[PDB]
Nucleic acid binder design. Structure first.
Length: 580
DNA sequence: GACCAACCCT
DNA sequence: AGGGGGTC
């Protein structure tokens, strides 16, 4: 049903109204220095398609994109913004972003294109991107006539839906969450990704060579112990050597057949010398293949930086997500892996990396929302919460809390936050189910308000159909009413966990917005680089380091007021690794 | 190209 | 709790 639209040869004044639906199409998944293939505008005066080359050599048009008074509605404005930044062009005045609007309304829907959003409000006059571009190897930009129609249909759909979405957002009391939190956050994220993080490639390469040598050493040793040669990365091949040939005990079974997971092999270490070498092999293999080679692929040879993409509209809890590369899972737990962080360096000379992290934010949030007196009081005293929990479940004095008692108390705390069952805790603490249920029972005696909260929250999700966060983020949990025990059980755990994890997301988001405002007021050159759930990473001049030590934590700490204080720790140094 | 099993992070 | 090579 051909939609009417002008395929313009040049930009005209009536295309630059102070209110428009704009589509700036970037079909590359990774939008960094990626082409723009089409522009559509839809407004009071009609519907228009433009060609980038024309539209972007045009001062009038670029002035308009840049103009903050001229208000745009879009879908995934960060994608457009970053693609335009790589071309030296600024995008401002995005008053409404449908992708973020749909995301707040229902993360479960998985809305990843305009069509998905449109179905939510019964609008079907737009095609799914995957249908116009195909998928995988057949991904292709179409001919002008087909492209032109699709862009305009998305612009047109954005035009039609903004009011319907803002109405529902308002009804959920999520309108401020879109306009004050997520949409501003999108601009800060656009800057972060474009700035990117500088990498020392020679430092990486050297590490690759050392690993290479060590992998060969341990690999040969494995063959020698095995008494033959086999592919160690092959489950089928490794299982045979471990369980048929060396006759090691079959502790666990996979769908495929044999389980060679770490927690399994560690149990088998005593029987044979070959097990410890294999775990080590894999550990090394993992760093070489994922983190050295995978990183060296994505470094941009020109700028010497990696430029991640932060997904703002993906997780079910309101958290961010990072890809190409993921900088939110760089090794930190074992020193061998941790060293990788020495490869991440400031972008200018005489600058330093500055890391700031919240301390036990999830448990602090639980205390606040649960209103547990015993937990509130623990954090007001600034105690060690795991040592404290140990004391309370084991009924002992600080003097008597052994490292094992702590480790155990800690596991209980995570479990409460993830809302696990006696079985899950038993699996984690490697103890009997009865013992696990004794711990939990003890925990709830020590913290009755937390118990009260878990019961009440499951009941509220049952009554309302969703659970909310502090800043009115929302998550629907249909399965909570399901008659299957396992499906219902999982729903209840989400019921318990989401307001904790989700409210923590909200807090750090606000901190990021607040922090940005302060950095500008202060006219500081410091800049945000990464966010890893409970921490922010910046780079700034050595001269600016002392000020940031006061400023960054103050801003993060005052983001919200709760019944307990928030606590931030910081460090800085010449590399990410040294900011410890 | 799609799954599985494995291992990285908060 | 939430994410991010081998085989057929």
């Amino acid at each position: 049903a051909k939609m009417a639209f002008t395929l313009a040869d040049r930009v005209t004044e009536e295309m630059l109204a102070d209110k428009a639906a704009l589509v700036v199409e970037v079909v590359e998944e990774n939008y960094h220095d990626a082409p723009i293939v089409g522009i559509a505008v839809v407004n009071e005066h009609g519907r228009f398609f433009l060609r980038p080359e024309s539209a972007l050599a045009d001062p009038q048009f670029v002035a308009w994109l840049g103009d903050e008074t001229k208000k745009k509605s879009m879908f995934d404005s960060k994608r457009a913004a970053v693609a335009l930044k790589w071309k030296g062009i600024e995008l401002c005045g995005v008053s409404f972003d449908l992708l973020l609007a749909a995301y707040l309304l229902d993360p479960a829907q998985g809305v990843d294109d305009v069509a998905a959003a449109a179905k939510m409000k019964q609008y079907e006059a737009v095609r799914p991107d995957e249908a116009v571009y195909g998928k995988g190897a057949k991904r292709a930009v179409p001919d002008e006539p087909v492209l032109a129609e699709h862009l305009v249909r998305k612009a047109a759909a954005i035009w039609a839906l903004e009011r319907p979405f803002l109405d529902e957002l308002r009804r959920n009391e999520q309108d401020r969450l879109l306009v004050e939190l997520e949409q501003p956050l999108s601009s800060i994220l656009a800057e972060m990704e474009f700035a990117g993080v500088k990498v020392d490639t020679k430092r990486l390469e050297q590490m690759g060579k050392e690993l290479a040598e060590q992998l060969r050493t341990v690999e040969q040793r494995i063959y020698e112990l095995a008494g033959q040669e086999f592919n160690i990365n092959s489950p089928k091949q490794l299982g045979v050597i471990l369980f048929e040939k060396l006759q090691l005990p079959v502790l666990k079974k996979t769908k495929t057949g044999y389980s060679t997971s770490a927690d399994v092999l560690e149990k088998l270490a005593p029987y044979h010398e070959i097990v410890e070498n294999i775990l080590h092999y894999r550990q090394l293999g993992k760093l070489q293949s994922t983190y050295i080679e995978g990183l060296l692929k994505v470094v941009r040879p020109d700028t010497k930086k990696v430029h991640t993409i932060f997904n703002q509209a993906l997780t079910q809890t309101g958290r961010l997500s990072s890809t190409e590369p993921n900088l939110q899972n760089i090794p930190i737990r074992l020193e061998e892996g941790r060293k990788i962080r020495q490869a991440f360096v400031p972008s200018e000379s005489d600058w330093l990396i500055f890391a700031a992290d919240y301390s036990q934010i999830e448990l602090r949030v639980l205390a606040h929302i649960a209103e547990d007196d015993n937990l509130m009081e623990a954090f007001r005293r600034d105690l060690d919460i795991h040592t404290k929990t140990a004391m309370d479940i084991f009924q002992v004095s600080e003097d008597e809390v052994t490292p094992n008692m702590r480790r155990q108390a800690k596991a209980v705390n995570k479990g409460i936050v993830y809302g696990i069952s006696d079985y899950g805790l038993a699996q984690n603490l490697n103890i009997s189910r009865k013992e696990a249920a004794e711990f939990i029972e003890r925990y709830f005696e020590s913290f009755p308000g937390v118990k009260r909260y878990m019961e009440n929250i499951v009941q509220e999700a049952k009554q309302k159909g969703y659970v909310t966060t502090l800043l009115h983020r929302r998550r629907y949990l249909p399965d909570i009413t399901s008659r299957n025990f396992n499906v219902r059980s999982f729903a209840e755990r989400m019921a318990m966990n989401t307001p904790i994890q989700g409210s923590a997301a909200d807090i750090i988001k606000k901190a990021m917005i607040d922090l940005n405002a302060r950095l500008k007021e202060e006219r500081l050159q410091a800049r945000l680089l990464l966010q890893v759930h409970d921490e922010l990473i910046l780079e700034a001049p050595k001269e600016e380091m002392e000020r940031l030590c006061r400023l960054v934590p103050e801003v993060m700490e005052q983001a919200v007021t709760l019944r307990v204080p928030l606590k931030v720790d910081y460090h800085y140094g010449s590399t990410w690794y040294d900011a410890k």
